Amino acid sequence: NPKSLTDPKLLKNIPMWLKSLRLHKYSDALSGTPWIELIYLDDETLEKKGVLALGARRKLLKAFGIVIDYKERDLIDRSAY
């Protein structure tokens, strides 16, 4: 879902970004922190913070991996930051 996941407006709004994934369940906890630093969180940190669901950690890990890949590629519009 790179069309909406890579969208800078969605990335700028962590809540909407989570709503796009459909895991808003963690949006109440993950929100409040930018995806730029959030992508730097490890699975153990995410587990310690919350989102115990391993599946959610796996999907979120893959999504964050793709986001990190896009961030490394730099194909994201500077509008994101």
Add this chain to the structure above:
RNA sequence: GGAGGCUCUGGCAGCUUUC
């Protein structure tokens, strides 16, 4: 086959009571 329930493994998932 129909229906209800529970675990997250995050879905046309598994287990299970029942007709």
